[PDB]
From a paper:
Intramembrane proteases are one class of membrane proteins, which share the property of cleaving transmembrane (TM) proteins to release cytoplasmic, luminal, or extracellular domains that move to new locations where they can carry out their biological functions. Rhomboids, first discovered as part of the epidermal growth factor signalling pathway in Drosophila, are characterised by a core of six TM helices. Structures of the rhomboid protease GlpG from Escherichia coli and Haemophilus influenzae have revealed that the catalytic dyad serine and histidine forms part of a water-filled cavity separated from the external medium by a flexible loop and from the bilayer by TM helices. Substrate proteins are thought to diffuse laterally through gaps between TM helices to reach the rhomboid active site.
The first one was obtained from a completely delipidated protein for the wild-type (WT) protein in a trigonal crystal form (space group, R32) and diffracted to 1.85 Å. The structures of GlpG WT and S201T in this crystal form are largely identical except for a small difference in L5 (rmsd for Cα atoms excluding L5 is 0.15 Å). The hydroxyl of Thr201 points away from active-site His254 and is within hydrogen-bonding distance to the side-chain amide of Asn154 and the imidazole nitrogen of His150, both residues being part of the oxyanion hole, thus explaining the inactivity. The mutation of serine to threonine results in a displacement of side chain of the active-site histidine by ∼ 1 Å. Of the 18 fully or partially ordered detergent molecules in the trigonal crystal form of GlpG S201T, many take similar positions to lipids, binding in grooves and crevices in the protein and demonstrating how the native structure of GlpG is preserved in a detergent environment. Six detergent molecules surround L1 and two occupy the space beneath it, thus preserving the structure of L1. BNG514 observed in the trigonal crystal form occupies the space between TM2/TM5 and protrudes into the active site. Such an insertion of detergent results in minimal structural change involving only a partial displacement of L5 in particular residues (residues 245–247). Glycine and proline are residues that are known to introduce kinks in TM helices, and it is probable that the TM helix of the substrate must bend towards the enzyme thereby juxtaposing the cleavage site of the substrate with the active site of enzyme. This detergent molecule may be mimicking a rhomboid substrate bending towards the active site. A small displacement of L5 lifts the side chains of Phe245 and Met247, but Met249 in the present structure still plugs the cavity near the active site.
Numbering used by the authors: 91 to 271
Write the structure that this text describes.
C-alpha cells in the first residue's frame, strides 16, 4: 500500500514550505503564513491554519512527518480521509490558539497535530480493539520519548506544553467519541 491523499499532500506541502523557508528565510515565510500577528491581519483566514505547515529545523520536520506518515496514514487508510482532515483541522486550530495565548504568534509546525494523532490512535486501540487502529507497545515507548523531548524543551525550540496538551486533548476526545459510537 501507499499513503492516502491527505497524508501525502500534507507531507508534500510541509516539504515545499520548508524549502521556501531555507531559500527565503524563516521570517519571510512567517510573514505570510504565521498566525495573525497584527490586527490588520485578523481576517486573513488561512493564517489560523497555515502556521502548521512551517518547521524550524531538520529534526522538527523529520520526526513530525514520520509520526504523521505512520499515524495519519493509518487513520486515513482504516477510517477515511475525512477523519484525518477533521482531527488535523481541530488540533491545529486549538493548539495554535493556546500557543499564541501563552507565547505569541511566532510559531509553527505539526507538533500539536501529532500529539492529537498519538492520543487518538492510542485511546482508540485501548478502548476499541475492533477498529484495527492502535498504538503498538514498542511505539508507545518511542512516542513517549518524543513527547518528553518537547515537554522538557530538550532542543530549546519547543511549543508551550499547554499547546501540547491542547492537541493531545483533541485526539483523546475524538477517540472517546468514536469509541462510544
Ligand atoms: C519515529 C516515528 C515512528 C516511525 C514509525 C515507522 C513509520 C513507517 C511508516 O510505514 C508506512 O505507513 C504508511 C501508512 O501508515 C503505509 O502506507 C506504508 O506502506 C508504510 O510503509
Ligand atoms: C499527486 C496525487 C495527490 C493525491 C493523492 C492521490 C490518492 C492516493 C491514494 O492512495 C491510497 O492509499
Ligand atoms: C504547498 C504550498 C503551501 C502554501 C500554503 C497556502 C498559503 C495561502 C496564502 O494565500 C495568500 C489570496 O488573497 C490569498 C493569498 O494572497
Ligand atoms: C468566523 C466568521 C468569519 C466572519 C468574516 C468577517 C469578515 C469581516 C470583514 O469586515 C470588514 O473588513 C473591517 C470590516 O469593515
Ligand atoms: C493544519 C491545516 C493545514 C493548512 C491548510 C491551509 C490551507 C490554506 C489554503 O489557502 C488558500 O489558497 C487558495 C488558493 O489560491 C487562495 O485562493 C486562498 O486565498 C487561500 O486562503
Ligand atoms: C529514530 C527513528 C527510528 C524508527 C524505527 C522504526 C522501527 C520499525 C517500525 O516499523 C513500523 O512498525 C509498524 C508496527 O509494526 C508497522 O505498522 C509499520 O509498517 C512499520 O514500518
Ligand atoms: C522515535 C522518536 C524519538 C524521538 C527522539 C528525538 C525527537 C526530537 C524531537 O524534537 C524535535 C523540537 O521540536 C525538535
Ligand atoms: C483543552 C485545552 C487545554 C489547555 C491547557 C493549557 C494550560 C495547561 C497548563 O500547563 C502547564 O503550564 C504551562 C503550559 O504552557 C507549562 O509550562 C507547564 O509545563 C504545564 O504543566
Amino acid at each position: 500500500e501507499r499513503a492516502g491523499p491527505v497524508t501525502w499532500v500534507m507531507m508534500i506541502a510541509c516539504v515545499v514550505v520548508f524549502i521556501a523557508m531555507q531559500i527565503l528565510g524563516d521570517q519571510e515565510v512567517m510573514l505570510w503564513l504565521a498566525w495573525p500577528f497584527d490586527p490588520t491581519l485578523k481576517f486573513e483566514f488561512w493564517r489560523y491554519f497555515t502556521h502548521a505547515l512551517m518547521h524550524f529545523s531538520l529534526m522538527h520536520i523529520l520526526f513530525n512527518l514520520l509520526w504523521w506518515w505512520y499515524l495519519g496514514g493509518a487513520v486515513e487508510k482504516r477510517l477515511g480521509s475525512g477523519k484525518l482532515i477533521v482531527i488535523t483541522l481541530i488540533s491545529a486550530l486549538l493548539s495554535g490558539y493556546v500557543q499564541q495565548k501563552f507565547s505569541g504568534p511566532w510559531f509553527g509546525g505539526l507538533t500539536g497535530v501529532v500529539y492529537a494523532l498519538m492520543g487518538y490512535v492510542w485511546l482508540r486501540g485501548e478502548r476499541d480493539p475492533q477498529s484495527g487502529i492502535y498504538l503498538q507497545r514498542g511505539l508507545i515507548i518511542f512516542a513517549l520519548i518524543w513527547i518528553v523531548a518537547g515537554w522538557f524543551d530538550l532542543f530549546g525550540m519547543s511549543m508551550a506544553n499547554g499547546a501540547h496538551i491542547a492537541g493531545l486533548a483533541v485526539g483523546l476526545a475524538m477517540a472517546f467519541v468514536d469509541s462510544l459510537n
